[PDB]
Amino acid sequence: PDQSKAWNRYRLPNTLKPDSYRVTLRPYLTPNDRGLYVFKGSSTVRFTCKEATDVIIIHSKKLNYTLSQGHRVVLRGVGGSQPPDIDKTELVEPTEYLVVHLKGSLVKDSQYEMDSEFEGELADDLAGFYRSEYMEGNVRKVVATTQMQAADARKSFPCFDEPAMKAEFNITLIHPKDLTALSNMLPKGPSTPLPEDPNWNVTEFHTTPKMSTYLLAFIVSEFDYVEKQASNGVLIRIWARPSAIAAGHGDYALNVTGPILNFFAGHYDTPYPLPKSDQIGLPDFNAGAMENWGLVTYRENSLLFDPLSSSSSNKERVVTVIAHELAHQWFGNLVTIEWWNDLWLNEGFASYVEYLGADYAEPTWNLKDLMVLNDVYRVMAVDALASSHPLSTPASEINTPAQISELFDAISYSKGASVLRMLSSFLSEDVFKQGLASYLHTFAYQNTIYLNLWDHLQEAVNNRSIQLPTTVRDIMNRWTLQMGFPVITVDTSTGTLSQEHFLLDPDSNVTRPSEFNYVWIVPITSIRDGRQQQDYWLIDVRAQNDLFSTSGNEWVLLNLNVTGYYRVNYDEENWRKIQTQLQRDHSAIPVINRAQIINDAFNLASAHKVPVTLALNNTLFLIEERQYMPWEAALSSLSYFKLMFDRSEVYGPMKNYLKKQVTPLFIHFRNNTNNWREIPENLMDQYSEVNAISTACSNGVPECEEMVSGLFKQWMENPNNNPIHPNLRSTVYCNAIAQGGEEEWDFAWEQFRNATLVNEADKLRAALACSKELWILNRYLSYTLNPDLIRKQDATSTIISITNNVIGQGLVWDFVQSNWKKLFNDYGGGSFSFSNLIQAVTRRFSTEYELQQLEQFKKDNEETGFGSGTRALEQALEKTKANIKWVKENKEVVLQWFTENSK
Amino acid sequence: VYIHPF
Numbered sequence: 001p002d003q004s005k006a007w008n009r010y011r012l013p014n015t016l017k018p019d020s021y022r023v024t025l026r027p028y029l030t031p032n033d034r035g036l037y038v039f040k041g042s043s044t045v046r047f048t049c050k051e052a053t054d055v056i057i058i059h060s061k062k063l064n065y066t067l068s069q070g071h072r073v074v075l076r077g078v079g080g081s082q083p084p085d086i087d088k089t090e091l092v093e094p095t096e097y098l099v100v101h102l103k104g105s106l107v108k109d110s111q112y113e114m115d116s117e118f119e120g121e122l123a124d125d126l127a128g129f130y131r132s133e134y135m136e137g138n139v140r141k142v143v144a145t146t147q148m149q150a151a152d153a154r155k156s157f158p159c160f161d162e163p164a165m166k167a168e169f170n171i172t173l174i175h176p177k178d179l180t181a182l183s184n185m186l187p188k189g190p191s192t193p194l195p196e197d198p199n200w201n202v203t204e205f206h207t208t209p210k211m212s213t214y215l216l217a218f219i220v221s222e223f224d225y226v227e228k229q230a231s232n233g234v235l236i237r238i239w240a241r242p243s244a245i246a247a248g249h250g251d252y253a254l255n256v257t258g259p260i261l262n263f264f265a266g267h268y269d270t271p272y273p274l275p276k277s278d279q280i281g282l283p284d285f286n287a288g289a290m291e292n293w294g295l296v297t298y299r300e301n302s303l304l305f306d307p308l309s310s311s312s313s314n315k316e317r318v319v320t321v322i323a324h325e326l327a328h329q330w331f332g333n334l335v336t337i338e339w340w341n342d343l344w345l346n347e348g349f350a351s352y353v354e355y356l357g358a359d360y361a362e363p364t365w366n367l368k369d370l371m372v373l374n375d376v377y378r379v380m381a382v383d384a385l386a387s388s389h390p391l392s393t394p395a396s397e398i399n400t401p402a403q404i405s406e407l408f409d410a411i412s413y414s415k416g417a418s419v420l421r422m423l424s425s426f427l428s429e430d431v432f433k434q435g436l437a438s439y440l441h442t443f444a445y446q447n448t449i450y451l452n453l454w455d456h457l458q459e460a461v462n463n464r465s466i467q468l469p470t471t472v473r474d475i476m477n478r479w480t481l482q483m484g485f486p487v488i489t490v491d492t493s494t495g496t497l498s499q500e501h502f503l504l505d506p507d508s509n510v511t512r513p514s515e516f517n518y519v520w521i522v523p524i525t526s527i528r529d530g531r532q533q534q535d536y537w538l539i540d541v542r543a544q545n546d547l548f549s550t551s552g553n554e555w556v557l558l559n560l561n562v563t564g565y566y567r568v569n570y571d572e573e574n575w576r577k578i579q580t581q582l583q584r585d586h587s588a589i590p591v592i593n594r595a596q597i598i599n600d601a602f603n604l605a606s607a608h609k610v611p612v613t614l615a616l617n618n619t620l621f622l623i624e625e626r627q628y629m630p631w632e633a634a635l636s637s638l639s640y641f642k643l644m645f646d647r648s649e650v651y652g653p654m655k656n657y658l659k660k661q662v663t664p665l666f667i668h669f670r671n672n673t674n675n676w677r678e679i680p681e682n683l684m685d686q687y688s689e690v691n692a693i694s695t696a697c698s699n700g701v702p703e704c705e706e707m708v709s710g711l712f713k714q715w716m717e718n719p720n721n722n723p724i725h726p727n728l729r730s731t732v733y734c735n736a737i738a739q740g741g742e743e744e745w746d747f748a749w750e751q752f753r754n755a756t757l758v759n760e761a762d763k764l765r766a767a768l769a770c771s772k773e774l775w776i777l778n779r780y781l782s783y784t785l786n787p788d789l790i791r792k793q794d795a796t797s798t799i800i801s802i803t804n805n806v807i808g809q810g811l812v813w814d815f816v817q818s819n820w821k822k823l824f825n826d827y828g829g830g831s832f833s834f835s836n837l838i839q840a841v842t843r844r845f846s847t848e849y850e851l852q853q854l855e856q857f858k859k860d861n862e863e864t865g866f867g868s869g870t871r872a873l874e875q876a877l878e879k880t881k882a883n884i885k886w887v888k889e890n891k892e893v894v895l896q897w898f899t900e901n902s903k
Numbered sequence: 904v905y906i907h908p909f
């Protein structure tokens with residue numbers, strides 16, 4: 001593949017820059033003779049030549065061209081320019097280009113127009129312009145809809161499909177006369193009959209703002225909607241299948257959307273500039289949602305809400321996903337990343353700001369506290385590997401659509417959010433939002449890199465005369481340009497602090513150099529016997545300060561409420577004082593720091609920085625902990641023990657220990673809910689209740705097993721009167737299936753096939769993977785691959801649910817090794833979250849035998865490659881090596897600890 | 904896009 005030719009290189013030339021496009025698309029919603037669903041379109045792109053060139057290189061993916069005046073395209077001049085004749089065109093598949101070879105060169109700073117006529121498949125592939133399907137009674141409904149991000153706009157029409165190639169778009173949709181056409185903007189005049197065939201209408205839309213190609217959306221459906229003008233005058237509509245809308249299932253979204261949009265407009269002092277923001281829920285959708293500017297698309301499951309069958313956790317999902325997509329109207333649409341290597345400027349911001357918007361709409365839920373579990377601790381697992389990557393990867397490394405898709409990962413989302421949470425904490429949100437307002441104003445309708453953000457934050461810092469140990473850029477560059485995070489180790493006898501790059505495996509090999517030497521500039525907050533001390537900045541690898549020195553009974557903890565992106569170790573004397581505090585009165589330690597103490601110590605133990613028994617000792621007080629968060633932090637960390645040990649002699653004592661620790665909590669909830677008749681008022685208490693049930697049942701509390709089997713049996717006896725509160729359904733369904741047999745399984749499967757809401761179906765689909773019968777798991781695996789039984793959007797998610805079951809481990813890994821080409825080609829090998837399957841199937845590996853299989857899997861498939869799962873395979877290899885050594889080193893001490901402490 | 908935390 002000759003690298004000297006521009007059309008064989010992945011990045012577009014800088015020689016041409018588009019100005020504006022018109023696009024006409026026409027989906028055919030009934031199959032043709034071939035049984036193929038197709039769309040036909042045309043386009044004109046106007047562009048400026050920035051540097052003289054004899055080739056037009058523009059993106060094109062799976063499009064077929066209708067010849068016009070002897071070629072695939074026609075090239076015309078603008079404002080008097082006179083373009084050369086077209087020599088010939090070619091489609092270059094790897095780089096997804098249409099290449100127009102010219103008989104001469106275009107002229108610098110002149111404009112040109114290029115006309116195309118084309119056709120593509122309206123495939124059920126969830127990418128570009130695609131089809132989604134549902135049933136209304138026995139009538140098949142087919143929807144034309146879109147997903148462009150990252151690199152699929154080019155699959156719908158020829159375009160310069162990179163995010164810094166911003167343009168205006170003039171969209172026309174041609175569609176059956178009975179169906180509604182939607183796009184980013186409002187219709188431009190009324191919808192008129194197609195002259196050649198009045199069975200079709202033609203809907204033209206107003207020109208978009210200047211924007212990136214990946215934000216375009218085109219939808220044709222018979223959906224209904226509810227609507228309300230938001231307090232900032234923007235029209236909000238929630239669109240979904242008619243039955244959902246009539247059932248009122250869009251009403252919650254309508255309650256929160258406009259108010260969140262207005263809240264963000266106010267908080268960032270930057271209006272939303274479009275006349276409307278439609279939210280629309282699609283039956284088939286790859287990701288969770290997509291922030292298309294003016295027409296935000298969602299999985300049905302993440303937009304619709306039924307107050308009589310959806311759980312509180314489902315309700316949290318709706319408001320948080322809406323908040324994230326609305327955050328993007330500012331961070332991503334109005335101001336857009338220059339290139340995908342800086343993705344966190346879109347998604348890290350959306351992941352942080354989503355909590356501010358969700359907290360605005362639901363202030364009693366205290367959602368912002370959950371950032372520590374949902375983001376900080378989530379990303380720290382991968383970011384403690386030598387094979388992690390910086391928040392801002394060098395742009396030169398990110399070239400292919402696979403490499404781009406791969407970056408939609410825990411680093412860009414949750415590390416992005418965590419670093420922003422830290423930043424807002426040390427600046428104050430008042431100062432942070434002032435800098436952000438200036439950033440948004442300056443770069444509106446343009447593109448940014450990470451340096452542009454620091455400049456505007458510096459401006460606010462300078463205006464407020466805030467004194468930092470250096471500039472915003474030099475502090476934040478430490479958290480952005482190098483991977484990883486530090487462990488801060490305190491010696492409370494002398495008050496010394498030291499930092500080093502935290503690695504789960506000390507033996508692992510960091511091959512990525514850092515110009516910052518893996519040293520950070522760290523804002524350190526702290527408490528002494530519960531009282532907050534003065535803040536401190538750690539700039540060097542080591543320092544001394546009496547803030548960190550103790551004597552007598554005093555203890556200190558660093559990182560109050562885990563605002564900072566770092567872990568903390570102490571001398572064992574201070575740890576023993578913390579453990580004493582947890583036994584005396586655990587409420588003296590802020591709840592978030594109770595999660596911290598647990599999660600940090602477990603990770604420190606893996607890294608050989610504290611004995612494993614110290615981390616296990618930190619869970620002893622949980623027997624009297626009622627709060628959601630510290631229990632969730634413990635369960636999260638103990639997940640790793642389950643992965644390492646659930647096929648070993650260690651597992652029984654582990655389960656015995658958890659059964660002892662959770663029983664009083666379970667009994668507390670049994671009494672508090674008046675024998676499961678009620679749910680707690682507070683959302684955190686609701687979540688705590690669900691975990692206590694899940695934990696009690698999984699670890700063999702007999703009252704829990706009886707409760708779930710009894711409830712499930714009562715439902716089977718009364719299928720239309722489900723006695724199980726929505727909050728408990730996931731865990732009751734799973735454990736009833738696990739405790740039961742094929743009769744329970746078949747009932748749940750039938751319920752799943754007959755489901756009317758995605759939420760109920762999702763709970764059943766996860767539950768069916770809880771069977772303990774190998775033959776049932778095998779049969780279920782065969783269903784995941786059948787698009788008539790399990791929608792394609794859900795296939796790999798269900799396979800992951802199977803592999804997480806200890807009996808499905810061998811089954812799924814053997815399946816993955818045996819079917820790699822199929823999974824890669826048909827199940828999203830270059831798309832979002834393909835890493836999820838590699839991660840899930842390999843995370844139990846703790847043996848040389850498994851390692852050798854994984855290395856052989858890498859060798860055997862070198863020709864196919866691993867697409868957007870390439871880094872995940874490297875990380876799987878690193879973790880597997882770490883796990884082998886960790887099991888060797890810990891199995892006997894852990895077995896003895898669980899045995900001695902579970903009685 | 905929104906992707907649920909794995």
Ligand SMILES: *[C@@H]1O[C@H](CO)[C@@H](O[C@@H]2O[C@H](CO)[C@@H](O[C@@H]3O[C@H](CO)[C@@H](O)[C@H](O)[C@@H]3O)[C@H](O)[C@H]2NC(C)=O)[C@H](O)[C@H]1NC(C)=O
Pocket residue numbers: 020021022044045046168169170207
């Ligand atoms: C997409 O639709 C937009 C909006 O209708 C089109 O923008 C319009 O384009 C015309 C023709 O190029 C612009 O005319 C220009 O006006 C000034 C005269 O004051 C002059 O400097 C230029 O020489 C040119 O004649 C017009 O301003 C503009 N209208 C708006 C509201 O921006 C655009 O052309 C369409 N793009 C495509 C590819 O069809």
Ligand SMILES: *[C@@H]1O[C@H](CO)[C@@H](O[C@@H]2O[C@H](CO)[C@@H](O)[C@H](O)[C@H]2NC(C)=O)[C@H](O)[C@H]1NC(C)=O
Pocket residue numbers: 366369532560561590592
């Ligand atoms: C650390 O986080 C805790 C827990 O969120 C904060 O405690 C809250 O404080 C607010 C304002 O004082 C009160 O309205 C609430 O009673 C507390 N909320 C909860 C959920 O407990 C605490 O303020 C934080 N500490 C610092 C220094 O910010």
Ligand SMILES: *[C@@H]1O[C@H](CO)[C@@H](O)[C@H](O)[C@H]1NC(C)=O
Pocket residue numbers: 036038039063064119120121122
């Ligand atoms: C595009 O062309 C190829 C090759 O002729 C053909 O197989 C395919 O069906 C065409 N696609 C559509 C949607 O017409």
Ligand SMILES: *[C@@H]1O[C@H](CO)[C@@H](O)[C@H](O)[C@H]1NC(C)=O
Pocket residue numbers: 177178179180181191192193201203
């Ligand atoms: C189709 O065209 C007619 C006008 O000729 C219009 O009244 C009707 O609403 C159009 N339908 C849609 C769904 O756009």
Ligand SMILES: *[C@@H]1O[C@H](CO)[C@@H](O)[C@H](O)[C@H]1NC(C)=O
Pocket residue numbers: 251252255307
């Ligand atoms: C939306 O708000 C209205 C008015 O406050 C309320 O009655 C209704 O229960 C809410 N709907 C949902 C689905 O939350």
Ligand SMILES: *[C@@H]1O[C@H](CO)[C@@H](O)[C@H](O)[C@H]1NC(C)=O
Pocket residue numbers: 434435438456459460463
């Ligand atoms: C800083 O102050 C200047 C001068 O008053 C003002 O123009 C600018 O908008 C301010 N910038 C920020 C980020 O507050």
Ligand SMILES: *[C@@H]1O[C@H](CO)[C@@H](O)[C@H](O)[C@H]1NC(C)=O
Pocket residue numbers: 611613614617
């Ligand atoms: C864990 O607790 C026991 C006493 O309950 C103690 O013997 C042991 O040393 C503790 N482990 C560590 C590392 O402190």
